[PDB]
Each structure stands twice: as structure tokens, then as C-alpha cells.
Design a protein around this ligand. Structure first.
Ligand SMILES: CCCCCCCCCCCCCCCCCC(=O)OC[C@H](COP(=O)(O)OCCN)OC(=O)CCCCCCCCCCCCCCCCC
Ligand SMILES: CCCCCCCCCCCCCCCCCC(=O)OC[C@H](COP(=O)(O)OCCN)OC(=O)CCCCCCCCCCCCCCCCC
Ligand SMILES: CCCCCCCCCCCCCCCCCC(=O)OC[C@H](COP(=O)(O)OCCN)OC(=O)CCCCCCCCCCCCCCCCC
Ligand SMILES: CCCCCCCCCCCCCCCCCC(=O)OC[C@H](COP(=O)(O)OCCN)OC(=O)CCCCCCCCCCCCCCCCC
Ligand SMILES: O=P(O)(O)O[C@H]1[C@H](OP(=O)(O)O)[C@@H](OP(=O)(O)O)[C@H](OP(=O)(O)O)[C@@H](OP(=O)(O)O)[C@H]1OP(=O)(O)O
Ligand SMILES: O=P(O)(O)O[C@H]1[C@H](OP(=O)(O)O)[C@@H](OP(=O)(O)O)[C@H](OP(=O)(O)O)[C@@H](OP(=O)(O)O)[C@H]1OP(=O)(O)O
Ligand SMILES: CC(C)CCC[C@@H](C)[C@H]1CC[C@H]2[C@@H]3CC=C4C[C@@H](OC(=O)CCC(=O)O)CC[C@]4(C)[C@H]3CC[C@]12C
Ligand SMILES: CC(C)CCC[C@@H](C)[C@H]1CC[C@H]2[C@@H]3CC=C4C[C@@H](OC(=O)CCC(=O)O)CC[C@]4(C)[C@H]3CC[C@]12C
Ligand SMILES: CCCCCCCCCCCCC/C=C\[C@@H](O)[C@H](COP(=O)(O)O)NC(=O)CCCCCCC
Ligand SMILES: CCCCCCCCCCCCC/C=C\[C@@H](O)[C@H](COP(=O)(O)O)NC(=O)CCCCCCC
Ligand SMILES: CC(C)CCC[C@@H](C)[C@H]1CC[C@H]2[C@@H]3CC=C4C[C@@H](O)CC[C@]4(C)[C@H]3CC[C@]12C
Ligand SMILES: CC(C)CCC[C@@H](C)[C@H]1CC[C@H]2[C@@H]3CC=C4C[C@@H](O)CC[C@]4(C)[C@H]3CC[C@]12C
Ligand SMILES: CCCCCCCCCCCCCCCC(=O)O
Ligand SMILES: CCCCCCCCCCCCCCCC(=O)O
Lengths: 604, 605
């Protein structure tokens, strides 16, 4: 009985402007209703109804025009796939060929599945637009105490082509018949199981077992944290240090914070209307939810706390303390490379495939998902540097003869060899090479080659930073020279990233901006406070991340160690607030070509 | 798409036998389908269709007959309330009177709300019976590759009165119009808000915030429980005892186990179809779920663990250890008597009202809810005895001069005065007096006066136990005499309760047991293993609860008796839990015979 909310959750976000304006009409009715000349009123509503029915005529015209355009495109795509399949069967029947033709079959199958989803989306369009007309017209007659709404509906909407046409139904039946008599080789149970569209978007809930587990893992994590504070304030001794430890376990804290903050992004994208399932090309009918990410965050959270607490205590006296941390990372590695069909095997298979393509950048094309991860792995380098220290620490600074040799020179945590500089230039190198590939593939030097410059600036800042320090460590006479050259590149990079991420990424500061001062014309998120507040945060922390990478090759005192351990967490909160406005921008480009399905092509 | 599961969740459990048999029909179609005599098959399906369409004719006849009966009752109830309201308005307009007439208005309002719910239930009946006919007939034509199903539907079900009648709609509109023009004094927004029926039964879910909180409270409690074991094995000392402690905190463990096991009952009753909302008379459109009980169990669980862990440790050195336990029970008491409109205020208001009526038994009538609680409070007496010891302990054995005087003679935990006997005969006395009232009100000595006998037997067993233990305590020559008289009453009670609850409560061992040997003719729960297994448990633990009330009279001098009591109080709870299933089920099978899916609300003259 709450249609407003029903339509607000059952609308294709890309076509949000082709759907009847229910709330505006309600405002109109309750406006003319709350305000009246209480002959004066007789002529007053003789003018309000004119406007009301006038607006209704325009809205019905829009739905009929939008409906006609989509049906034409549907007939075209149908003819397109029909020929490809006929040609494919003609080629296979007329005929390395098997493997390519196998994909050819797989390509044709994804094409017909994607086409069916589009026909269902168009059917649900007409169904929810007719329900809105009837429910609002009843509110009009019920508010104006008249019978004109009934007259209007029976003579206009009830005859409207958007509500009278009967070709989408035939097209849907034609496709399912072809998919069953051509691809499935005769099985409607398999064909329908493939072409059937379940509830999608923000109109489908999650299992209560997922909500329960999510909450359970969280509650254990909260208690195992208060314990680590007290135990860290009592059982620990001052005779030994806590830095080799803070160094290895700091990495795990960042990865868990990433998965937790990433689930809060999936939630905001879903409730705002940003179709991240089309931007990242994820199965439209089978995809994970914010709850599944919150669940994996809690699981690895408890695993981390128990390992560190077993290090503060001595649960076992036959087990060397330098095995708890090794088992934790060994476990996390297996949970991601499990060759069994369990624990989100399909979701993990996607991540394992993407990572490979993003670590072989120059040999593969770049899609939003591929480049987006490399920008995610460009804010998760502290994890790579922590892993770096751990490897050398257990190889050069670890006394296995001493069972308690895990927690006690520093060459493993220093860029004495540049290992903490080249490793710091791994994620930037991936994005630099991925950009050049895009340029070669697009033949456009803007923005493919201008952006490849934003990634190079880091190489210089990291290099000069490591050189000035080493020369100064040898007391050479090139200490101030490198120091000045270094600080120069630092400020250059800090601004070549802030501008490109507040202009070429978010897309704010638009010539076409009316009331949203310094903001794009159309903003998806609800409040304008979010955009203005995030702009301040990106600036404040864009000049505090170039310093956290220049202290990887400089801060002799443990003071610099505190700085690094206090910044790695804040950098994560920057990629988190930057994951909102980046995806939103990409969505506002699909809401212009009205693209609610992907464009799947077949192989010749 | 899954109609079978849509029917079995959207069916009024009382009328479950008036609804089309969808699964049987599917079995028939897929049976004749899996078994094809591959002329032979031409005549084979010429005989299968005959049977299939024959069964369809009978089912449609049943739905039309059941539908006709309910509509007649609806017209009568409508005329009944109509006259009462007319008379009520005529009396008020024609006229202590204000407060009785206020109730009179409230009585008329609940009557029209309950009537509306009945009309909606009857509308949903016709709607789900026509959907089943169409969905099965399509499966028949789709399985037999014929068009007979379509012909059958258009010429029979499409014309059937259960699908053609249009009077329920008029009745529903008539009632809402009367409730708005008579009671609300003109406001359809208030009238509809009162007479509107939301999703009810096993077809409505719970908020994910409830599932999350439930899980969160559980996780903290589990960790706080592993911490009590390790702390109880390290920080604790042997110089002092742990019995005054086990005595006070044992009571809280039982109450939390009750609320947790009770939520698992609400779950089983809802998924089996036992309408506990009609048996207990709870708002049909606003009632708590198993999740809300699991949530309160976890909350009080953490509160208990933290209090006992603060006693093993010394979180504060200015706070005497004998205040953690006092704050816990003080808090639980407030959470139940909160005068604010928060934390289930409505649900708590019902429990507070029922408890009062069940503690003033002789002055009020007895309903399933009232008598059922007194039987719930008859298995929660260890909590009363623990509360008893604690009070005397903090009054006669507590050294406040010693800040650490909470954990260290025993006269507070002994029946030296009979306090552990009269207190042990409080819940049985309530049930005894409630039964006699029923007899006076029913004038029937069976089963009202035979039942009052099962409750008296306890009075004797506890008494003689004390006589033998107290005479023996003064080494009198009447030690063996009382001991023999005592053991006699013990076995008498152990069997006068097992039989009554195996034949007069559960209702098993029926002349009409058929395939269900030693079980009633119709069993609601899915497996027959549950009934047989529970019978064994009620016996094994019906002869182990009479002993846990005979060790409350200076009998087991050694701490072994203390161990016995602390190990039985938990098992007794698991008996009332397995007895809460078959008792409510029995009451339901009595409503599934008169087809009563709404309560009968009367008005005041
Ligand atoms: C999922 C639900 C929740 C799971 C919870 C898991 C258990 C957590 C238990 C935490 C208990 C800590 C606080 C203990 C309070 C009471 C005891 C106390 O205060 O004394 C400290 C106690 C005894 O000390 P002591 O006798 O000196 O120990 C000798 C060991 N050689 O010290 C002890 O001996 C207590 C040792 C507790 C160790 C708990 C941490 C995990 C232990 C096993 C290793 C698991 C992690 C493995 C990591 C691999 C990588 C993932
Ligand atoms: C190699 C080391 C590099 C250093 C960093 C550590 C490794 C990377 C850590 C982050 C991993 C990626 C997390 C986010 C990726 C997903 C992004 C997204 O929004 O996509 C969601 C989507 C779920 O829907 P999906 O099932 O994929 O739908 C189509 C399926 N065909 O797809 C997904 O959800 C895909 C992701 C699967 C579910 C989450 C996986 C959690 C485990 C990640 C590995 C953690 C351990 C790394 C190694 C040890 C490090 C100490
Ligand atoms: C809801 C989410 C979860 C909530 C968790 C709440 C906190 C739980 C913390 C449990 C910690 C116990 C184990 C501690 C492990 C590390 C320290 C250790 O092993 O040593 C014991 C430690 C120090 O002992 P010590 O220094 O002798 O104390 C002096 C006091 N005069 O001993 C201590 O000093 C530790 C004391 C811990 C006390 C925790 C229990 C609650 C304390 C406040 C009272 C709350 C309950 C109030 C009850 C009222 C009725 C409801
Ligand atoms: C006086 C002391 C005697 C010794 C024992 C302790 C007190 C009694 C403990 C048990 C309390 C009753 C628990 C079960 C009662 C409910 C039974 C049931 O299935 O009914 C469910 C129903 C919920 O639906 P409802 O909202 O009532 O629908 C109509 C509303 N008009 O109605 C309800 O849910 C009603 C119950 C409200 C919700 C649960 C209340 C939990 C708190 C109970 C008190 C606990 C503390 C007692 C005092 C301290 C003891 C240490
Ligand atoms: O009963 P429904 O068919 O579901 O219709 C209801 C109902 O309208 P009707 O009484 O005309 O049926 C509500 O009105 P009241 O019953 O409370 O008088 C109305 O609320 P409004 O009067 O405020 O419009 C509500 O709509 P909503 O909940 O959005 O306010 C609307 O449900 P629909 O929106 O689905 O028509
Ligand atoms: O698509 P629907 O209208 O929701 O109907 C489906 C569908 O039947 P139709 O194809 O005739 O529509 C299923 O059959 P397939 O598509 O898989 O061939 C059928 O399953 P069965 O063939 O096994 O009967 C299923 O019913 P169910 O899920 O109970 O098996 C039934 O949905 P309904 O039960 O709601 O008619
Ligand atoms: C000051 C020195 C050391 C470094 C200079 C690099 C960056 C700090 C700044 C300087 C000028 C900026 C550029 C000025 C103008 C433009 C064009 C502007 O064009 C668009 O809006 C393109 C939109 C589209 O392609 O969709 C995008 C941002 C960009 C490249 C800016 C990106 C960031 C730049 C390169
Ligand atoms: C064993 C000695 C020490 C005590 C005797 C009392 C109980 C142990 C037993 C003896 C005979 C039993 C009765 C034998 C037969 C019946 C009739 C039987 O009839 C019904 O089914 C009544 C149903 C109804 O009234 O609704 C119900 C149980 C009852 C009363 C039994 C209840 C339990 C009784 C009283
Ligand atoms: C490293 C730590 C691991 C912890 C490991 C646990 C991570 C989750 C912590 C709590 C937040 C998620 C669970 C909270 C509530 C969810 O049930 C709802 C479901 O949607 P609904 O409210 O519309 O039914 N989710 C939300 O409301 C949105 C997400 C809430 C985010 C809260 C931000 C703090
Ligand atoms: C004193 C202790 C306090 C603990 C305090 C926590 C008490 C709850 C413990 C766990 C059981 C309840 C929560 C488990 C799952 C629920 O989400 C589902 C919801 O129904 P669904 O599965 O159909 O979606 N409930 C059930 O499946 C039925 C109840 C499960 C009972 C489990 C018995 C152990
Ligand atoms: C200087 C500091 C305080 C700036 C803080 C900026 C943070 C708090 C702002 C910037 C962007 C904001 C987010 C922008 C978008 C959404 C999606 C919306 O559906 C929920 C709120 C949420 C999730 C906002 C949360 C608060 C937010 C993260
Ligand atoms: C001797 C001992 C082992 C006997 C144990 C008896 C117990 C375990 C049996 C007896 C009655 C049984 C219950 C009977 C009814 C239901 C409702 C059903 O929907 C879920 C199972 C459930 C909840 C059963 C659980 C197991 C049960 C509690
Ligand atoms: C750097 C530390 C990060 C962890 C601390 C929390 C950071 C994320 C906070 C998100 C706040 C906004 C959440 C919106 C939720 C909602 O709208 O329901
Ligand atoms: C005496 C201790 C009692 C507590 C231990 C658990 C007792 C209840 C066990 C219930 C088991 C059956 C639960 C059925 C759940 C389901 O069917 O989904």
C-alpha cells in the first residue's frame, strides 16, 4: 500500500526519468488540497484539475515515446543474434575449430540470456507505469471527491500503446523457444533455468543465517579486542621491543579494514541506485551482497585477534612464538586459492582471474573492473611493505635457536637496498603501463597519456627521497641537493593527483552546475554535504599519503615508525570515500545512453 | 513458482483439510506419467484422466460446501454485532455507567475488528483454492500433452460458486463503513488502521536488525563463558567455599535457559501450524516472534556472565563483592517493571497482567494462558528457593564488616523452619486452587477434581520428607516411620503426574491410534520418533524431579546433595520444554475440529 516506496525500489536506475513522477503528483494534489478558497472554490478547482490532467497527458506521452524506442532496439538485437546463430549452425554444420566454436556457442548463449533480461525489464516498465497511473488517479478522485480520474484513465491510459501493445510477450516466448530448440538441443527445464530472471537491485533481501553469522563473528571480534588491550597492558614486558610485531600484524589490520569498508560501499551503491553490477560486469541474477563482505571481514578479524593474543600469551610451550603469524597469512592465502567448490568459490574465481589480468597489464585490454582494482592495490602497498619486512626478518634477523625469537639490524625494514622503494613503485607501475595500453588501443593522447604522467611523478618522488637519505647517511656533499629535488617532486605529485581525482575522476567543478555550486549538474547521492565534506578530506589526506611513501626510504627515530603505523589506516579511508564518487560518475554516463544491460558480442 | 510451498505457508492451519490437495495431485500426474504402458497406452490414459478429473470434481465440491457454511456464519455474526451496537447507541443516547459503557464501546470495537479478520481469511481461502486449480490443471495438460484441463477449468471451476460468489467483498465494505460512521465517528484513516490485517502466520519474516542483535548478544556471551571457565580454574582460591555463590547465581542460569528454550518452542509451534496466538489469545496482527525471545535470552546472558566474572576478579576494590549479584537481580526486576513505553512495553504489560491474575487464582476465571503459566512457574521453583537462600544469607550469615564476605550455618539453605517446604508448595497450591475454581464454574468433577488430586500429592511428599528428616535430625524414634510414609507418597505422586501428562495432557494412547501405535489418530509434528522419544524422557525425568524436591528437607547432609540439586534444576527445564510442544498441539487439534480460526469476542450489556 506504500507505492511511492514500491516504485522507488523497483525502478531501473538508468531509466529513472522515464518512470511516472508519483511523489510530484501527490505534492500537487495535497498542495491544491491544503490550499483552496474555502464560486471562488468552484472556479479554483476548475483551474487545478486543468493543470493536473495537463501534467498527466505529458507523462503518458513520455512513457509511450520511451517504450516505442526500446521495442525497435529489441527487434534489431533479436534479428542480429538470430543471424549470428543461423550462421554459427551453418558454419559448424558446413564444417582448434572446436575450442573456438565452443566459445562461439558460449558467446551465443550469453547473448540470448542478456537479450531475455532486457525484454523482462521492458515488461516490468509498462506494468509499474500503469499501476502508478491507477493508484494516483484514485488519490485524485479521493482528494478532489470527483470521478474525472476514472474517466481520464478509461479513455487515455487504458488505451495508451505503452499499456495496449502486445509484442514484448511474443518476443520473450520466441527467444525461449529458439534457446530451447537450438542451444539446449531440447530441454525447457535447462533453457528456462538459464534465461529466468530473479528479483534484482534493492528489491531482494539476504538470508537471516547471513545476518546472524555476520553479527556473531562481529560480537566475538569485539570481545577478543578488549582482551588484547588488557593483555597488552599486563602480560607484555618492556625488556623486549614490539616493532617487529607491529610491523608484521599491521598488514592484516589493513586488509580486514578494506573488506569491511568495501561492504559499506556495496551498500551505498545499492541504496543510491549506482548499478555497480553493470560497471563491474557481474552476473545480473547471481551476485554477492554487502552482508557476504561484512561476514568475511568478521571471520578474518577473529583469526587475526586469536593469533596475536597467542603471541602475548603462551597457549603452547612446544610451539615457537614465530609460527602464529606464519599460520595466519598461510590460512588467508588458502581461503583465497581453495580449489574446492566451497566458501564463495565462484566469487573467488572472478577475483583470481581479474588479479592475473591486472598483473599481466600489457598483454590484456583494460575494463573498469581491471583498472579499478589496480587503483585499489595502489592504496594497499603498506601490506606489500609489511610482507617485505616479514620475509627478510624471518631470514636475516630471526634467531630460530631462541624459541621466543619472534619479538626481540632493521635492514629488513629499511630501503638500504631500495627494496622499500621498488616494492613501493609496483602498483603505480601497473597503472602507468595499463594507461599506455589504453592510449595505443584508443589512439587518443587525452586522457590516456596525460594520466600516465600522474603515475610517473611517484617514481621520481620515491627515487629522490631514497637518494637524498642514502647520500646523507654517507655524509656525502649531495645531501641538500637531492633533498631539494625530492621535496619538489613531492608537492608536484600531491597536486597532479588531487586535481585529476577532483576533476577527471569524481567529475565535480562543472561549467554546467546551477544550484550545486562546484558540483556536477546531477548528483546521485542524497545530500550535497557529502560531496563538499569529501572534497576537504581528499585534500587533507592527499598531502599526507605522499609523506607516508617518502618515509619508506629517512625517519631514523622510532618517531617515523609511529607515523607509518598511524597513516596506513587513514589512506584506506581515502580510497573508501573515493570509491563512491568514482563509480557514481561512471553510472551518470550509462543513465544518458539508457544502458541497463551489457552489450555481449559473439565470436566469428 | 513453488506453489506447493506457497500453499503450505499461506493456509489457515485449522482449515488445512478444506484446501485443495496439490501434492497428492502432482503425485497422481507424475505416477501415471512415470508409469506409461508403452492402443494399450491410448486406453491407459483414457482411464487415468477419468480418475484425475473424478478427484477434481470431489475437491471442488468440498471447497464449495465449506465456503457456503462459513458465509452463513458470517451473515449471522454480522447481524449479531449490528444489533448489539444499535442497542448500545440506543442505550447511551437513551441514557459508573460511563466506565461500563466505555468498555461496552471497547467490546464492540474488538468484535468488529475480529469479524473483519474472519471475512479476510475467507477471501484468501477462495483466492488460493482457484490459483491451485489453475496451476495443477496446467501441470496436467503439460504432463498429459492434452487440452482437457483448460476445458475442465472454464466449464467447472471458473463457474464454481466458491470462485463466482461476490458477497464477502460487500460484507467487508459494509463493516468498514459501519466502524467508520459509528465508532471512529468519521475517520477512515483510523478505522482502516484498526481493521487492517497484515501478513500473519509463517508467511511474515523478522527485521534483519533483530537477527543481527540476536547473533551479536550470542557471540559475546560465548566468549564471556570461555573466560569464566579459565578464570574459575585460575584466580579462584580453595581457602574459601563456592556454594553460597553457586546457590545465588544458579537461579539466574535457569531463567535464561527458560527464555531461550521457550523461543525454540515459539519456532516449532509456528513452523508446525499450532496456532498459539489463538490458544493464548494474543493480538492476531501484532505479536512477538522466536527472534525477540532469543534476543532477550542473550541480553540477560551477558549481564549474568559479567556479574559473576566481576566476583572472580576485583574490577573495583571500593565495591564490596556482595553487590554484583544484588545489581543483577535488581536490573532484571526493572527490565520487567519498566513503566516507560520501551523494550517491548506491550509484551511486558501482558505478562505483568497474567502473573497478577495467576497469583490471585481464586478471584478470577482460568484460561489456557493463566493455567499454562502456573504450570510454567511449577517447574521454576529452584529460582524461588535460590532467591529464598540469598535473602536469609545476606541477613543472617553475611559479614558486611568483611568487604569480601560474599564468598566464605547453612540454616538459610536448610528447611530447619520449613521455609524450603512451604516455598516449595507455592506453585502447586496455585494450580490446586485454580482447578477447584474451574470445577465450581463447570460443575464437572472430571477432570477438574481428579486434577486437584495430582497437585495435593506433592503437599504430602514434601511434608513427610521433612517429618522423617526433622525427627531423624533430633534422633527421635519416629525416624523410620516418617521415612516409610514419605517414600510411599513420593512414588504415588511420580505416577499420578506421569499418567495424567501421558494420557490426559499430551493425549496419546488413543483407542483410535491406527498406524500411529500408542499415539493419537492425527499428529501435527512431522516425525513419530519425537512422540515416542519424548514419552521415554518424561518417564526418566518424572522419577528424578520428585527427588529434587525431597532433598529440600534436611536429607542429603553431604555436599553431594548440593551437587544433585545443581545438576537437576537444569534437566527439569528441559522437561517443561518437551511438554510445551504436545500440550499446545493437543489444544490445537480441538480447534481444528470446530474450524475456529478467530476468537469469539463478546460485548458487555
Ligand atoms: C571464537 C570465539 C572466541 C574464541 C576465544 C579463544 C580463547 C581465548 C582465551 C583468552 C584468555 C586470555 C585471558 C585469560 C584469563 C584467565 C587466565 C589468566 O589471567 O592467566 C593467563 C593464562 C594462564 O597463564 P599461564 O599459566 O602463565 O600460561 C602458561 C602458558 N605456557 O593464560 C593462558 O594460558 C590463556 C591463553 C589463552 C589463549 C587464547 C588465544 C588463542 C590460543 C590458541 C591459539 C589460536 C591462534 C593461532 C594463530 C594462528 C594463526 C591464525
Ligand atoms: C594478492 C595480494 C595482494 C594484496 C592485497 C590482498 C589481496 C586482495 C584483497 C582484496 C580482494 C578483493 C576484494 C573486493 C573484490 C570485489 C569487488 C566487488 O565489489 O565485486 C563484488 C563481486 C561479488 O559478486 P560476484 O560473485 O563476483 O558476481 C559475479 C560472479 N561471477 O566480486 C567479488 O566479491 C570478488 C571478491 C571475492 C570475495 C572477497 C574475497 C576476499 C578474500 C581476498 C583475499 C584476501 C587474502 C589475500 C592474501 C593474504 C594477504 C595477507
Ligand atoms: C559486552 C562486550 C564484552 C564485555 C567485556 C567486559 C570486560 C571483560 C574483561 C574480562 C577480562 C578478564 C581477563 C583479563 C586478562 C588480562 C589480565 C589478567 O589476566 O589479569 C587479571 C586482571 C588484573 O588483575 P589485578 O591487577 O589483580 O586486578 C586488581 C583489582 N583490584 O584482572 C582485572 O583487573 C580484569 C577485570 C575484568 C573485569 C571484567 C568483568 C566486568 C567488570 C565490571 C563489572 C561489570 C559487571 C557488573 C555486574 C552487576 C550486575 C549485572
Ligand atoms: C515473578 C518471578 C517469578 C519467577 C520467574 C521469573 C519471572 C517469569 C519469567 C518468565 C516470563 C514469561 C516468559 C514467557 C511469556 C510469554 C509466553 C508466550 O509465548 O507469549 C508470547 C507473547 C508475545 O506476544 P504479545 O506481544 O504478548 O502479543 C499480544 C500483546 N498484547 O507474550 C510475551 O512474550 C509475554 C512476555 C514478555 C516478553 C518476555 C519477558 C521476559 C522477562 C521476564 C521476567 C524476567 C525477570 C523476572 C524477575 C527477576 C528474576 C531473577
Ligand atoms: O487500501 P489500499 O488499496 O492499499 O490503498 C491505500 C489506502 O487507500 P484506499 O483507502 O483508497 O484504498 C490508504 O488510504 P487510507 O485507507 O489510509 O485512507 C492510502 O494512504 P493515503 O490516503 O495517505 O493516500 C495508501 O497509500 P499511501 O500508503 O502511499 O499513503 C493506499 O495504498 P497505495 O499507495 O498502494 O494505493
Ligand atoms: O514459469 P511459471 O509460470 O512460474 O511456472 C513454473 C514452471 O512451469 P511453466 O514452464 O509451465 O510455466 C516450472 O516448469 P519449467 O519451466 O521448469 O519446465 C514448474 O516446474 P515443474 O515443471 O516441475 O512443475 C513450476 O512449478 P514447481 O516449481 O512447483 O515445479 C512452475 O511454477 P508454479 O508451481 O507456480 O506453477
Ligand atoms: C604544477 C605541475 C608541477 C604539475 C601539473 C599537473 C597537475 C598538477 C595539473 C596541472 C593542470 C591540470 C589539468 C588542467 C586541465 C585539465 C583538462 C580537464 O578536461 C576535462 O574536463 C576532460 C573531461 C573528459 O575527458 O571527460 C581534465 C583535467 C585536466 C587534465 C587537469 C589535470 C591535472 C593537471 C594536469
Ligand atoms: C498409582 C496410585 C499411587 C495413584 C493413582 C492415581 C494415578 C497414578 C492414576 C491411577 C488411575 C489413573 C486414571 C485412569 C483413567 C483415566 C481416565 C482417562 O479418561 C480420559 O481420557 C478423560 C479425558 C477427558 O476427560 O477429557 C483420563 C486419565 C485417567 C483419569 C487416569 C489419570 C491418572 C490416574 C488417576
Ligand atoms: C574489521 C571489523 C570487522 C567487523 C565484522 C562485522 C561487520 C559488520 C558490522 C555491522 C554492520 C553490518 C550489519 C548491520 C546491519 C545490517 O543488518 C543492515 C542490513 O540492511 P538493512 O538495515 O536495510 O536491513 N545493514 C545496514 O544497515 C548497512 C550497513 C551498516 C554499516 C554500519 C557501519 C559501521
Ligand atoms: C542462554 C543462551 C542464550 C543465547 C542467546 C542466543 C539465542 C539464539 C541462538 C541461536 C539460535 C537462534 C538464531 C538462529 C537462526 C535464526 O536466524 C533462524 C531464523 O529462522 P530461519 O532459519 O527459518 O530463517 N531460526 C531458526 O532456524 C530456528 C531456531 C534455531 C534454534 C537453534 C537451537 C540451538
Ligand atoms: C573531514 C572528514 C570528517 C570528512 C568525512 C567525510 C566522510 C565522513 C563522508 C564523505 C563521503 C560520505 C559518504 C557519501 C555517501 C554515502 C552514501 C549514503 O547512502 C550513506 C552515507 C555515505 C556513506 C556518506 C558517509 C559519510 C562520508 C563517508
Ligand atoms: C532420552 C532423550 C534423548 C529424549 C530427547 C527428546 C527430545 C530431544 C525430543 C523430544 C521432542 C522433540 C521435539 C518434538 C518437536 C519438534 C518440533 C519440530 O518442528 C522440530 C524438532 C522438535 C523441536 C523436536 C526436537 C527433539 C525433541 C525435543
Ligand atoms: C580510518 C578508519 C575507518 C573505519 C571507521 C569508519 C569509517 C566508515 C564510516 C562510514 C559512515 C557512514 C556509513 C553510512 C551508513 C548508512 O548510511 O546507513
Ligand atoms: C537441559 C539443557 C537444555 C539446553 C540444550 C538444548 C535443548 C534443546 C534442544 C532442541 C533440539 C531441537 C531443535 C529443533 C530445531 C529445528 O528443528 O530447526
Amino acid at each position: 500500500m506504500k507505492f511511492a516506496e514500491h516504485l522507488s525500489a523497483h525502478i531501473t536506475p538508468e531509466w529513472r526519468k522515464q518512470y511516472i513522477q508519483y511523489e510530484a503528483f501527490k505534492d500537487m494534489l495535497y498542495s491544491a488540497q491544503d490550499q483552496a478558497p474555502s464560486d471562488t472554490v468552484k472556479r479554483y478547482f476548475a483551474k487545478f484539475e486543468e493543470k493536473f490532467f495537463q501534467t498527466c497527458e505529458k507523462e503518458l506521452a513520455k512513457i509511450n515515446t520511451f517504450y516505442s524506442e526500446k521495442l525497435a532496439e529489441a527487434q534489431r538485437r533479436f534479428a542480429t543474434l538470430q543471424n549470428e546463430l543461423q550462421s554459427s549452425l551453418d558454419a559448424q554444420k558446413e564444417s582448434h575449430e572446436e575450442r573456438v566454436q565452443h566459445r562461439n556457442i558460449k558467446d551465443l548463449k550469453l547473448a540470448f540470456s542478456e537479450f531475455y533480461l532486457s525484454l523482462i525489464l521492458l515488461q516490468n516498465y509498462q506494468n509499474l507505469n500503469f499501476t502508478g497511473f491507477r493508484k494516483i488517479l484514485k488519490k485524485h478522485d479521493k482528494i478532489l471527491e470527483t470521478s474525472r480520474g476514472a474517466d481520464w484513465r478509461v479513455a487515455h491510459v487504458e488505451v495508451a500503446p505503452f499499456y495496449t501493445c502486445k509484442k514484448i510477450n511474443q518476443l520473450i516466448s520466441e527467444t525461449e523457444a529458439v534457446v530451447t530448440n537450438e542451444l539446449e538441443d531440447g530441454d525447457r527445464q535447462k533453457a528456462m533455468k538459464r534465461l529466468r530472471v530473479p528479483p534484482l537491485g534493492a528489491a531482494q533481501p539476504a538470508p537471516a543465517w547471513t545476518t546472524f553469522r555476520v553479527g556473531l563473528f562481529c560480537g566475538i571480534f569485539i570481545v577478543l579486542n578488549i582482551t588484547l588491550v588488557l593483555a597488552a597492558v599486563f602480560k607484555l614486558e618492556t625488556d623486549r621491543s614490539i616493532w617487529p610485531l607491529i610491523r608484521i600484524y599491521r598488514g592484516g589490520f589493513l586488509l580486514i579494514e578494506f573488506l569491511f569498508l568495501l561492504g559499506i560501499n556495496t551498500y551505498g551503491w545499492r541504496q543510491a541506485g549506482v548499478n555497480h553490477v553493470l560497471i563491474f560486469e557481474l552476473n545480473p541474477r547471481s551476485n554477492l551482497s554487502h552482508q557476504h563482505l561484512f561476514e568475511i571481514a568478521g571471520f578474518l578479524g577473529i583469526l587475526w585477534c586469536l593469533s596475536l593474543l597467542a603471541c602475548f600469551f603462551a597457549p603452547i610451550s612446544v610451539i615457537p612464538t614465530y609460527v602464529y603469524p606464519l599460520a595466519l597469512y598461510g590460512f588467508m592465502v588458502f581461503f583465497l586459492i581453495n580449489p574446492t567448490k566451497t566458501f564463495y568459490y565462484k566469487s573467488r574465481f572472478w577475483l583470481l582471474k581479474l588479479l592475473f589480468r591486472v598483473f599481466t597489464a600489457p598483454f590484456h585490454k583494460v575494463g573498469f573492473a581491471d583498472f579499478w582494482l589496480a587503483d585499489q592495490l595502489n592504496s594497499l602497498s603498506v601490506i606489500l611493505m609489511d610482507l617485505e619486512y616479514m620475509i627478510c626478518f624471518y631470514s636475516l634477523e630471526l634467531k630460530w635457536d631462541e624459541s621466543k625469537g619472534l619479538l626481540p639490524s632493521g635492514i629488513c625494514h629499511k630501503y638500504t637496498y631500495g627494496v622499500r622503494a621498488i616494492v613501493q613503485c609496483i602498483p603505480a607501475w601497473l597503472r602507468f603501463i595499463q594507461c599506455l595500453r589504453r592510449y595505443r588501443d584508443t589512439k587518443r593522447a587525452f586522457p590516456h597519456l596525460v594520466n600516465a604522467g600522474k603515475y610517473s611523478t611517484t617514481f621520481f618522488m620515491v627515487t629522490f627521497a631514497a637518494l637524498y637519505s642514502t647520500h646523507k647517511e654517507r655524509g656525502h656533499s649531495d645531501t641538500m641537493v637531492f633533498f631539494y629535488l625530492w621535496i619538489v617532486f613531492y608537492i608536484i605529485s600531491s597536486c597532479y593527483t588531487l586535481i585529476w581525482d577532483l576533476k577527471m575522476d569524481w567529475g565535480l567543478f562543472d561549467k554546467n552546475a546551477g544550484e550545486n555550486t562546484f558540483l556536477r549538474e546531477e548528483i546521485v547521492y542524497p545530500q550535497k554535504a557529502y560531496y563538499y565534506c569529501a572534497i576537504i578530506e581528499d585534500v587533507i589526506l592527499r598531502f599526507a599519503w605522499t609523506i607516508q611513501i617518502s618515509i619508506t626510504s629517512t625517519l631514523l627515530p622510532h618517531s617515523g615508525d609511529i607515523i607509518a603505523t598511524v597513516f596506513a589506516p587513514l589512506e584506506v579511508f581515502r580510497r573508501f570515500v573515493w570509491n563512491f564518487f568514482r563509480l557514481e560518475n561512471e553510472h551518470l554516463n550509462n543513465c544518458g545512453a539508457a544502458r541497463a544491460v551489457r552489450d555481449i558480442s559473439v565470436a566469428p
